[PDB]
Amino acid sequence: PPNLTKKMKKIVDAVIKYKDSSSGRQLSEVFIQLPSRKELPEYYELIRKPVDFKKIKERIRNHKYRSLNDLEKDVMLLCQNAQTFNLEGSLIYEDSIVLQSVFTSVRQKIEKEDD
Amino acid sequence: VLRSVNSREPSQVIFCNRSPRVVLPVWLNFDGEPQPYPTLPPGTGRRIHSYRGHLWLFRDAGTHDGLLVNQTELFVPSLNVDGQPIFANITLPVYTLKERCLQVVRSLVKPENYRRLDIVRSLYEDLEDHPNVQKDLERLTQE
Amino acid sequence: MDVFLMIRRHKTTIFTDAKESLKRIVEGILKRPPDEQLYKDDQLLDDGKTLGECGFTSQTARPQAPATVGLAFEALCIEPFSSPPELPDVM
Amino acid sequence: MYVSDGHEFIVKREHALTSGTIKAMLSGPNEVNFREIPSHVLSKVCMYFTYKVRYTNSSTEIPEFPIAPEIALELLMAANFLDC
Numbered sequence: 001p002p003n004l005t006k007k008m009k010k011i012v013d014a015v016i017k018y019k020d021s022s023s024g025r026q027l028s029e030v031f032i033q034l035p036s037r038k039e040l041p042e043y044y045e046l047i048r049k050p051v052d053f054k055k056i057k058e059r060i061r062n063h064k065y066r067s068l069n070d071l072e073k074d075v076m077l078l079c080q081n082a083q084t085f086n087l088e089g090s091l092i093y094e095d096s097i098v099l100q101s102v103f104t105s106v107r108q109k110i111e112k113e114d115d
Numbered sequence: 116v117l118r119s120v121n122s123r124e125p126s127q128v129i130f131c132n133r134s135p136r137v138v139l140p141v142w143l144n145f146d147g148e149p150q151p152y153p154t155l156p157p158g159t160g161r162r163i164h165s166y167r168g169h170l171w172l173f174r175d176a177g178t179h180d181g182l183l184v185n186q187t188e189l190f191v192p193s194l195n196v197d198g199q200p201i202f203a204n205i206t207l208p209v210y211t212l213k214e215r216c217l218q219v220v221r222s223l224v225k226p227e228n229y230r231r232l233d234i235v236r237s238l239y240e241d242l243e244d245h246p247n248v249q250k251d252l253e254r255l256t257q258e
Numbered sequence: 259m260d261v262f263l264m265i266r267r268h269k270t271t272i273f274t275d276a277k278e279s280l281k282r283i284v285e286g287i288l289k290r291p292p293d294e295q296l297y298k299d300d301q302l303l304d305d306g307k308t309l310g311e312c313g314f315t316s317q318t319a320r321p322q323a324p325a326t327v328g329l330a331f332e333a334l335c336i337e338p339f340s341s342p343p344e345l346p347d348v349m
Numbered sequence: 350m351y352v353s354d355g356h357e358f359i360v361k362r363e364h365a366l367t368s369g370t371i372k373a374m375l376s377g378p379n380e381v382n383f384r385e386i387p388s389h390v391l392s393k394v395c396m397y398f399t400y401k402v403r404y405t406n407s408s409t410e411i412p413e414f415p416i417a418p419e420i421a422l423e424l425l426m427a428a429n430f431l432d433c
């Protein structure tokens with residue numbers, strides 16, 4: 001992993017800065033910092049492995065991701081969490097689905113165009 | 116001792132920076148603790164997603180001078196009636212000419228050199244005592 | 259609106275404020291008739307109390323930096339003030 | 350109603366009331382002289398006086414009171430010696 005982190009950075013940097021085409025909102029801001037235990041006890045209990053981006057940001061910093069395929073299934077787990085806690089069709093729900101295909105479409109561009 | 120209430124009830128809020136400083140929005144973590152949020156250019160304003168009952172404190176991001184929001188010391192998001200985002204007008208106070216003269220001096224000399232002025236031995240205390248975040252908290256919490 | 263100005267005459271000076279649209283106030287304070295008076299930058303001003311028409315809009319004659327006006331039957335250079343020391347610790 | 354290295358200046362009485370020290374010399378229990386302060390500092394002082402009243406508790410977007418760097422040392426001792 002010589003610049004493996006450097007490419008994970010771009011990937012996460014791109015997903016967060018994603019803007020809706022009609023609304024323009026950053027569409028990732030709900031998921032940035034997950035509220036605390038004292039302040040949301042029912043999330044941490046219903047959800048097996050809670051995760052938000054701040055943890056992924058600093059998990060990348062510890063470079064505990066051996067692979068990009070490793071990095072994906074965390075960001076994948078992140079939306080899979082929000083899809084269970086939230087109602088099908090709720091704003092948060094339908095957006096976690098969007099970012100799934102945002103991380104999808106972004107992984108292809110980064111890996112190739114840098115050898 | 117002084118922090119935000121955990122009502123999950125949201126509150127669309129918007130900060131209008133109507134002052135020449137660079138404003139530093141400060142959220143108060145539920146342990147009384149302050150957490151900082153991105154700075155605001157002087158003329159501009161920005162919309163936010165805050166939650167009702169929370170506490171916001173406002174402050175220059177460079178001198179940490181006392182900044183005024185909505186004409187009062189602090190700002191708590193009320194409920195937005197017709198969806199109208201609540202306005203946190205971040206403006207200046209009217210400092211005492213003593214205080215205003217204090218800020219300009221801190222801007223022109225480094226701390227390792229304050230004491231070399233040929234000025235009153237009292238003002239040295241008044242200079243070396245800088246405007247602080249948590250310090251102003253103990254002052255507001257006191258009664 | 260409200261314009262804040264500054265009249266000087268041989269180092270004696272008045273701070274007061276009036277509307278964007280005169281000297282009569284001088285007669286009450288200086289107890290000298292108003293017609294004997296009054297200009298800026300060598301351009302007397304006859305028709306008094308029209309304030310703005312000369313350049314004193316609500317942004318130039320503001321409290322933290324008032325606008326200078328002179329007073330006259332004699333012409334005079336109102337005596338300026340002292341100069342700053344520029345102590346060397348700063349900068 | 351109204352009131353070189355001395356005072357020599359006239360302002361409204363209420364604008365004078367701004368400073369706490371000058372709420373003491375006159376009307377105790379007119380003219381007032383200052384044997385320390387120059388004539389260039391008293392400009393920026395009574396400018397703060399007018400700047401104080403017009404803007405205090407007026408919800409309008411308050412602008413800064415300005416200070417030239419070559420003036421700071423001597424206004425500060427003043428506003429210290431003025432309780433304002």
Ligand SMILES: Cc1ncsc1-c1ccc([C@H](C)NC(=O)[C@@H]2C[C@@H](O)CN2C(=O)[C@@H](NC(=O)c2ccnc(N3CCN(c4cc(-c5ccccc5O)nnc4N)CC3)c2)C(C)(C)C)cc1
Nearest residue numbers: 029030031033034035052082123152153163164165166169
């Ligand atoms: C000021 C400023 N200038 C310039 S830019 C800017 C600015 C700063 C911050 C913000 C963010 C967006 N906004 C806040 O910072 C607000 C402003 C302050 O009042 C407080 N605040 C907080 O964020 C704190 N607290 C809470 O958010 C909190 C508390 C109690 N309950 C809460 N809920 C119930 C559960 N929710 C759900 C979450 C998820 C989910 C999330 C992540 C990953 C997976 C998931 O599944 N999924 N589904 C949900 N339903 C969320 C809402 C939230 C903080 C502790 C998190 C920092 C925006 C703009």
Ligand code: NA
Nearest residue numbers: 029030032033
């Ligand atoms: Na957030």
